[PDB]
Curated annotation (Swiss-Prot), chains A, B:
It comes from Methanocaldococcus jannaschii (strain ATCC 43067 / DSM 2661 / JAL-1 / JCM 10045 / NBRC 100440). Belongs to the UPF0254 family. This is UPF0254 protein MJ1251. NCBIfam families: PRK00962.1 (NF002122). HAMAP family: UPF0254. The lineage of its organism: Archaea, Methanobacteriati, Methanobacteriota, Methanomada group, Methanococci.
Length: 167, 167
């Protein structure tokens, strides 16, 4: 099977949970609209090993045996980075997760202040993009919209990548 | 902070995600209805370190450095146990988490065929309970009802335990 794992913060593990639901053939799920019927057939060849929500630096670091940069902001509930460090962390987590779990495709996501970042790392390439929504984890400005767009864009890109590289 | 981590399978990391959204003061989230305003004030003192959806044995094993029993059924997308091993695995994962991440409260959940199991392990005690719903991960029979019941029961027990032990 094509194995996937994720380490997600702003998208709340829903990239990986959607991939799982699609792969396991759930009849209805929140972001099913992103998958064509043919996509849903392709998805049955995918297995999710883990989808982790990892808001804390110490959690990411201990679970993946990596080191993250210091947060840019004081915030109790989650590591809070500017967009530059979110882009760096999404790559650090995707890379660490791929190594930890030996999966075909690893996904990292993080967003603090700004548009956040999603990294999709396959056996062949590393993709890294922001979301399309500027938001602020601390003030909650646009946070739900950023989470939604991050999950939609992460899934849309995952599907494109999966088809390009594996089908 | 009172730190929490979860390793969830049938509840799709939503016990730990609900704890996080309550703790971080989200004004709307799916299971917010389970919390009073006073419970939400207490929750501000909780931090989630990680909430992981870990359907794979090899996933769980590699992330938490534990060994899980062999599945009772063949199933491609997740480890599939009957009740006896679900109850063992919820406890093994809560114990593993608590060791790997050194949290105050760890929560394990798993359900294959049967009612599933949730373990809440605190600094002082271990709680282990089935959901109320018999379901089957492979056939999808009652899966969604069991998921929702497990989340609600998990969160309700977590709030009882948190109050009894920490407030």
């Amino acid at each position: 099977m094509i194995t996937v794992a994720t380490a997600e913060c702003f998208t709340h593990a829903n990239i990986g949970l959607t991939i799982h639901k699609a792969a396991a053939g759930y009849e209805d799920f929140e972001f099913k609209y992103l998958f064509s019927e043919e996509d849903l057939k392709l998805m049955k060849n995918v297995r999710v090993i883990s989808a982790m929500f990892v808001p804390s630096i110490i959690g990411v670091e201990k679970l993946l045996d990596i080191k993250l940069p210091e947060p840019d902001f004081n915030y109790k509930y989650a590591k809070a980075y500017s967009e530059e460090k979110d882009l760096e962390v999404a790559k650090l987590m995707a890379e660490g997760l791929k190594k930890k779990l030996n999966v075909n495709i690893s996904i990292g996501s993080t967003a603090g202040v700004g548009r956040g970042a999603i990294c999709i790392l396959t056996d062949n390439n590393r993709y890294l993009f922001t979301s399309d929504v500027y938001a602020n984890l601390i003030t909650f400005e646009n946070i739900k919209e950023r989470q939604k767009n991050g999950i939609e864009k992460g899934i849309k890109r995952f599907l494109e990548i999966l088809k390009k590289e594996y089908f």
